[PDB]
Symmetry: D3
Subunit: 294 residues, 6 copies
């Protein structure tokens, strides 16, 4: 009882994040991949749970590292329970996720767990490095980073599923395109949506001072102006300053450029699904997510 | 190569390696090896894993405790920033797990998970009580310390036990030692980190817990802890009060009692001159 | 102009007189006079005395509560500063005692002292619970409200009874109305956003109001409310989450039913004292919020 | 059992200030003035209690209005229990003091309590007015206010004692001289004393931004400079700015002027005491208090 | 060459995107109807004026802690206070370099004189505000005539150095200076309808004594509200809305409008006494449209 | 009328800085160079005042741009009178100094004044740009910037003197060596100690000074210094750590040797112009900072 109550007190920040939207995409994603994997439901429930645990845990930590205010329209967990509480709680879930990952009875599972998490930390580390050392990455550099940030859990889930699946053709190429698709879509939405209130508040990325795909464009597209770089350094919440930044980004074509990149990423993804036999479920998701641009 | 990433991510950890402390961990490892006698090949990995996880947790704890100094050095997030150190410290955790996967023992990762979760339970209660303003009892407090310290204490000795025919119980001594360390650390943080950094943290340390429960007609300590202030005089006031209600003598008396329990447990396990000397060296503070 | 100092010290108080509220106080005094039938010379003194202390206490309360708006107006310390408002509000307390010394009744200062100490006890517990992070129970809260509100209510009605032949006990109703008023205030400060205070200013104060108290004890598996209250945050998004939780746990319905029950109980008490058409109407008007 | 527990919890901030030194000086004052008033111990004890209670409550409120950090070497009560709690507690003691005055069985006590209290608040208001409205007063204006701030509590004690005394000789002139002597000595010490935290912290008056006797001199003595006014507006805790201000005050002779004013106040007190029959106890007190500016 | 000038002139380039050059241009045209300045000199004078004028607004925004100018973020809100300080002072001396191309022995003399006048005006405005000393109406106007007269006199004065028109225009320049500032003061507080220039009642957040506020302060000396609100330098929308309600209720806005209406009339008469200026008359009529509502 | 009260109000921050030590070195510097230029005392006196005004004015502005707390042991002027007043006051003195330069009666004086001031603003801008855009410069880039920051006022003084001197030999190389000597010596003291600024105020400013610059490039495997500079922290313990790091990577030793080299080069340059015992003594006295004994 004391143990179960003491645990309960510690998992509260995680319980809060469970109320946020997102499981739908995670659930649909797993189903889409199983059209190829045909993996036992018994193991999947574990892998599904493990993925949800590690994913939400990373988002709890990410909100702290990004000084974000809103997530999926909800206050971020550390806005309520406090940063020291959420840090320990999220880290508790990491090793709770290993405990569940220790039940797949596959000797190669723990290896994939460790590898995928270290890969995830590499990406987040680089994003935090560039932002907090005021060094804008190049378009190529940014893309490389997300492939480790997104690729960490994408490969963790898909990989653990493949451990008990007879499908064995390489799925890393498609996962990378999707990882790009999600983050760049995330970047486009965080700055192009006004009061849609889909996930975060108005241009929360500018207040974080982070380098997202649109801002990265304007920085290199227009090396004759240092406006964006200076505005990001301010890490300000001033709406007028943020509104100016967005107008400039449109004027330099950063938003139009991002849309075409997102539009291009969708096309490549379609081919990758088709080259693996086709995935009516996975193909459908992309079309739904593609409603954001144009 | 792209190996500049590892350097970038491990810089905050590399910074903390410059701090004193490895001597105590090494001497502790050697002292327990007089009984465990683990093959050096495995032992080498065990020490590395222990040092990584210990330092990695200490990076995170300083963030959770809003601490300013550690063993006389600035905290890592005071230099590299909280976001970077968080990612780096979590990075080292899982690098440490990778290293445990080189011990080639089916029960190694099992001990790893259990001990690590045990540490998080201890930290959680320490954080929960402090951030929900509910001072624990001595029993509740000591019970928490037994998991916080026991997390890393049992990890090392446990991993050492994984490759040793010495199967005698060291947990009583491990629990006595973990208690000894924290209560000792609590005592030092207030009787000697910057001036009373624990008071600025607002944490319930062993000395403060005594006065809170000892003289319940005053809520002074509780309120001072809630302010989480950096005022030297306010901090100076608290320690004088703690001293006047005997909170420090009580901590010393508990420490002196803890010292005896360790000595008796050491002799009851055959004796460990290296260990006994180490404890004696640490026991000089409450003399 | 001789001691123009009075003007300097009374400026914050004059600022608060511009705020709505006197109507309820006037109508309340009128309703009770239907039973007490107080001499106009004495009643007028009591009315001023009541207004002074009531406004003075609200000035102090706004400071202790870090409030931003009162009845749609900036709080006085938002303009003249916290030190000035403290001194002036304490000045008005003791100006009121001077005025009570004109009621001639030897027991007036005694009534004044007791009623004021009771009000300070109520505010103290409200402050104690909030600033020592210990949520009270419903009974504990209600006991406190009966001391906070009972302080000025009993002083007014009490002073009137000193010069009245109606010697029947009115304290049960005074307590019922006091709870009614505070619990009604608690409901609105969180159920609306406009009018009086700003959006959920009580959550930013971190104080335990009736709706929050319910949610805290109703669902002991969650510490959200406690933690949100500890943040003393001004984030609208966090506050919107808090009310949503309060609504989803039924704390708002519980407050309405508690208020509706208090309204009914009041009616029973009014009739038991002969009936008071004026007072019955006041209650009915104030009850329109629970819909 | 209950309610009395509430009184204890609500009176704690007051109990904390009782640990502070000072009761001795208040006690010696009561004894010294009673050499003339010869008040019955039955009444005197309450007058002493009423005086001590209201004074400490006023010092609690004063510390909040003055953003003070230390009083008599101890942290200010609101630095421990918080401003909202101390306010309610001090005002609670105010009316607790009134309850005590209702035990003198003299009907003119309630009048005196009211009058002296209103007088004190007038002084406090003006001091706060000048400071928070950035309007330095004249020397005459400052002294006029001090006679109301000190006289409020001074007149309460001596006056209440005189209600039960056959003396009936006019003592207000002496109380006024003592009132000035006390404040000007406080003003001088808060700025001239070493970094020695005997009462308040280093030049806490400059951080308060208040117009104390020394600063008042420099402002009018040298009207070609706005240094002092500008430093007081900053309300800084910068040691270097504060040390510079004291350097300026010394160079314009403000500290010497304050000493000479205090030396005169002491001399006048001797003459005033002599004119009322003499008071060896009071003479000893002033001589002891005068050792600081000598 | 390594013209690092671009890096240093970036904050200045940022402010050129703001509206305003049109009004400065129309003023030049209106006054050239009398002065008839040679085109070669006039073009430079226009450039010198635009440089020094924008440079002063860069410095002023820092001194006034403003948030918006002409609907745009203030330059130091992006590039930072240290950069804009150095950049605006750089442009001052770039303007001096330019004024030396008029080849007039008195141009630098007039330049120095006019800039010192502007700093006297700016200093007094800053002095009263940061020493919490409200000026009297006459005192306020005297400062405005020095603040505005600084650039007004530099432009027209430099033009007159190359003009056969030698009639005194300073009386008209003073009227226009007052008209400009008081119009600005009124708009910053009465035009809550739009964020066309500054943000909502930024003058109250600056704590400056503007014409509307000055009236209420002296008109109602039994109240210290305005003074106290200005001392708070608060960004509270509710406190600001209260101040405007108070200002309107004591007639400070009506008083300001009547003063502006009078300044408009005086300007028309002064223009006619100088021969008439259809161009200038049109500008005043257009600028007078804000308070005629 | 006769309101020199405005002047007092506007010049109070400037008069405050005159109480600070510093005039002595400037006086000795003027004397050392007059041993070659031999300028009429009437012209010399004006040149000295112009230099004193412009130099002090820039330091008032510089302290604002550098968030400095102390100067020469005294609080910075804006810590007392406020940033807005000091900015306006300091810019006022610039234009007062221009007025004074108009009294040297040389047709090229204003030209030299303008040119030198633009150069100083070029240097300061580069210093601020690197700091507020978090991009450490190279040693060569830094040295080039210092030649414009110091060169502005060094060349203004010496340049103005040479306008009234028959000594027409080139002093810019020596002027540049001394400019570097002065800045790098200040950098050394701000971290290793000069009874000037507060403890490692340069770390709190986040500026790239010569010692820090070394550590940045000397050990490029570490981002410690850059990150510490970005924190813009006032923590004495963090500052003390940086100093330990700087010493352990040899940044202080490298700075000392660079200064010793500048000292020798200065002596060689001085001898090359005929010798200057006065100037040689100044360098020797200032060089005691980087000597063990
Ligand atoms: C295939 C199955 C069964 C599940 C999918 C596995 C999943 C959901 C992997 C997560 C995909 C992803 C994009 C992970 C990134 C996690 C993370 C912490 C991203 C941080 O991105 P930021 O842009 O820095 O922060 P925001 O999300 O607030 O924008
Ligand atoms: C015995 C062998 C072979 C090795 C030693 C094994 C280890 C690492 C022992 C260390 C035990 C210990 C003291 C663990 C504490 C971990 C932790 C979370 C400390 C944080 O404690 P706080 O209460 O926050 O106070 P400090 O910040 O001063 O640490
Ligand atoms: C004359 C008659 C018949 C009645 C007089 C009417 C009076 C004086 C009523 C007072 C009743 C009341 C509600 C008193 C409250 C006083 C007080 C300290 C209010 C502040 O408490 P909070 O809990 O902070 O609520 P608010 O912040 O909304 O004010
Ligand atoms: C004469 C007898 C028998 C008794 C007198 C006992 C008392 C209470 C005398 C009053 C003495 C006095 C100086 C009262 C002043 C009241 C007060 C709150 C002054 C505070 O003014 P500040 O300028 O803030 O100075 P401090 O904050 O340093 O105290
Ligand atoms: C007549 C010709 C040919 C040209 C005139 C062109 C110009 C620039 C005339 C000067 C116009 C003017 C009013 C200048 C004042 C500059 C200044 C320092 C304004 C600052 O006043 P604030 O009170 O700060 O109000 P804002 O900050 O909103 O501008
Ligand atoms: C040579 C003769 C005849 C006279 C002396 C002429 C002068 C005053 C030369 C001054 C050279 C010098 C040191 C110029 C630098 C001025 C400046 C803008 C310094 C600011 O740079 P910082 O690095 O911030 O210096 P601080 O550390 O003092 O703030
Ligand atoms: Mg992130
Ligand atoms: Mg994020
Ligand atoms: Mg901890
Ligand atoms: Mg800690
Ligand atoms: Mg309240
Ligand atoms: Mg309230
Ligand atoms: Mg005071
Ligand atoms: Mg005081
Ligand atoms: Mg301005
Ligand atoms: Mg302005
Ligand atoms: Mg600089
Ligand atoms: Mg500097």
């Amino acid at each position: 009882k004391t143990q179960e109550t003491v645990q309960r007190i510690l998992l509260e920040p995680y319980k809060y994040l469970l109320q946020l939207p997102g499981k739908q995409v995670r659930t649909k994603l797993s189903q889409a991949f199983n059209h190829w994997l045909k993996v036992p439901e018994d193991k999947l429930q574990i892998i599904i749970e493990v993925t949800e645990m590690l994913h939400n845990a990373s988002l709890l930590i990410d909100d702290i590292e990004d000084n974000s205010k809103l997530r999926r329209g909800f206050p971020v967990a550390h806005s309520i329970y406090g940063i020291p509480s959420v840090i320990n709680s999220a880290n508790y879930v990491y090793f709770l996720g290993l405990e569940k990952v220790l039940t797949l009875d596959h000797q190669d599972a723990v290896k994939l767990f460790t590898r995928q998490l270290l890969e995830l930390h590499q990406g987040q580390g680089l994003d935090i490095y560039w932002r907090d050392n005021y060094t804008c990455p190049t378009e190529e550099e940014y893309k490389a980073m997300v492939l480790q940030k997104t690729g960490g859990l994408f490969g963790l889930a898909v990989g653990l599923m493949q451990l008990f699946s007879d499908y064995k053709e390489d799925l890393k190429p498609l996962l990378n395109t999707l990882g790009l698709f999600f983050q760049i879509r995330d970047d486009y939405a965080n700055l192009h949506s006004k009061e849609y209130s889909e996930n975060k508040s108005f241009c929360e990325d500018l207040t974080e001072g982070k380098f997202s795909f649109p801002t990265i464009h304007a920085i290199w597209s227009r090396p004759e102006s240092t406006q964006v770089q200076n505005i990001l350094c301010q890490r300000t919440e001033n709406i007028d300053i943020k509104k100016y930044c967005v107008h400039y980004l449109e004027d330099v074509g950063s938003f139009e450029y991002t849309r075409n990149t997102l539009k291009e990423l969708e096309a490549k993804a379609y081919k990758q699904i088709d080259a693996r036999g086709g995935n009516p479920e996975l193909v459908a998701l992309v079309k739904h997510l593609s409603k954001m641009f144009k």
